[PDB]
Amino acid sequence: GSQKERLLDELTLEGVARYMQSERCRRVICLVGAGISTSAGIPDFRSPSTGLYKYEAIFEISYFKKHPEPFFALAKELYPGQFKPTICHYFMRLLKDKGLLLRCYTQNIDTLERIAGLEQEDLVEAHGTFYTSHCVSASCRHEYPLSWMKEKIFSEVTPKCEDCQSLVKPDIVFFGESLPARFFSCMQSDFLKVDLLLVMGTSLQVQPFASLISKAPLSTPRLLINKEKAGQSDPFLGMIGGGMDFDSKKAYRDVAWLGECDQGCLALAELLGWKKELEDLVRREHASIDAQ
Amino acid sequence: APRKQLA
Ligand SMILES: NC(=O)c1ccc[n+]([C@@H]2O[C@H](COP(=O)([O-])OP(=O)(O)OC[C@H]3O[C@@H](n4cnc5c(N)ncnc54)[C@H](O)[C@@H]3O)[C@@H](O)[C@H]2O)c1
Ligand SMILES: *C(=O)CCCCCCCCCCCCC
Ligand SMILES: [Zn+2]
């Protein structure tokens, strides 16, 4: 239905937590970006202090096409010593484990969602991932895992395929490139049946991923956990398709929690009577990573 | 089906 109608008893975290407790709320989609990994020591872009601050072009595809050495250097620099998912990754894991997660759609390539125990099935890595890597040569397309790719990115040798010696590229989507087919397929099916859109650590500037929020049904509540409001229709572009409205008198289903996503998710977890379960998972999984 | 881009 396209009838706009209010399912949250009020436009707050508690309203959403209640909504989540309700029977109406069976299938949750998360949309995430760099905000949920910032605290795992991986910079985002739009953050003032880290991001696009020696070398935007280092992720356009044509620049990578001409000169790929700049990219592989950056990835040595940003390449973390240890991969601990965040509280907000683990919150997503809880949703899986309670059978609430229909899907997590993610712009992040860091692979943390998998490390937290989301499975390929749970995950639309709409911007690809570092998890896997392939030769660029059509006639080869030999596949490589993250250990082989790290050894190269840390050795400071441009990765070259062992069978044919083409450039071996991580399975990320560069700017310019097309998203995976799986993204559109999952998009067609998923957004019919979503009961709640949970939006974390994304500015929603990157298309087509941003437009996902308008593919939700109009009475699907949408919660944004973020440092800044994001997704509001621009005063000027709208002038000339289902954007965030948190504040107007017409606002009926969108809610904004502004802060760190670790606190936000930790708050929400608490309303749901999940805080102990979350605390234990995070503490337990990090310990296990620490013992690896 | 567009390709990744800023906006
Ligand atoms: N970790 C990664 O995989 C990574 C890192 C940088 C950029 N990118 C790519 O660059 C593009 C940028 O997209 P994006 O919107 O995710 O990043 P962005 O930098 O464009 O926007 C991130 C948003 O998260 C907020 N934020 C940052 N840290 C936060 C925190 N701890 N708590 C709450 N909010 C926080 C920022 O205020 C901003 O609104 C994407 O296409 C993405 O694939 C990926
Ligand atoms: C589309 O937005 C792709 C963005 C390119 C990746 C951004 C850089 C993030 C690299 C982090 C270090 C390595 C992670 C395994
Ligand atoms: Zn090859």
Domain spans in chain A, listed from the N-terminal domain onward: 1-38+86-126+181-292, 39-85+127-180
CATH of domain A1-38+86-126+181-292: 3.40.50.1220
Q: How far from A35 is each of A39, A131, A145, CA to CA, in Å?
A: 8, 20, 25
- Give me the architecture of the A39-85+127-180 domain, per CATH: 2-Layer Sandwich (3.30)
A234 DSSP assignment: P
Whether residue A112 contacts residue A131, with contact meaning beta carbons closer than 8 Å, is answered with: no
Kindly name the residue from A67, A89, A127, A142 that is annotated as catalytic: A127
- Distance, in Å, from the CA atom of A212 to the CA atom of A197, rounded to the nearest integer, reads 10
Give A133's strand partners. Answer: A144, A170
For residue A66, the number of C-alpha atoms closer than 13 Å in the C-beta half-sphere is 6
Whether residue A86 contacts residue A139, with contact meaning beta carbons closer than 8 Å, is answered with: no
Q: Resolution to 1 decimal, in Å?
A: 2.7
Q: How far from A7 is each of A24, A194, A253, CA to CA, in Å?
A: 9, 13, 7
State whether A179 and B7 contact (CB < 8 Å): no
Contacts of A236 in chain B (CB under 8 A): none
- Distance, in Å, from the CA atom of A216 to the CA atom of A93, rounded to the nearest integer, reads 22
Whether residue A31 contacts residue A197, with contact meaning beta carbons closer than 8 Å, is answered with: yes
Whether residue A249 contacts residue A224, with contact meaning beta carbons closer than 8 Å, is answered with: no
Q: Are strands A222-226 and A254-258 parallel, antiparallel or unpaired?
A: parallel
A130 lines ligand 2 (CB under 6 A): yes
Kindly report whether the peptide bond that precedes residue A208 is cis, defined as omega within 30 degrees of 0. Answer: yes
A44 lines ligand 1 (CB under 6 A): yes
- Distance, in Å, from the CA atom of A159 to the CA atom of A289, rounded to the nearest integer, reads 27
Residue matched to tokens 């929400």: A268
Give the angle subtended at the CA of A284 by the CAs of A121 and A99, to the nearest 5°. Answer: 35
Nearest atom in ligand 2 to the alpha carbon of residue B4 is 1
Residue A226 tokens, joined? 């973020």
- Distance, in Å, from the CA atom of A267 to the CA atom of A131, rounded to the nearest integer, reads 31
Determine the angle formed by the axes of helices A275-290 and A261-271, rounding to 10 degrees: 130
Whether residue A254 contacts residue A245, with contact meaning beta carbons closer than 8 Å, is answered with: yes
What is the end-to-end Cα distance of chain A in Å, rounded?
50
Whether residue A108 contacts residue A36, with contact meaning beta carbons closer than 8 Å, is answered with: yes
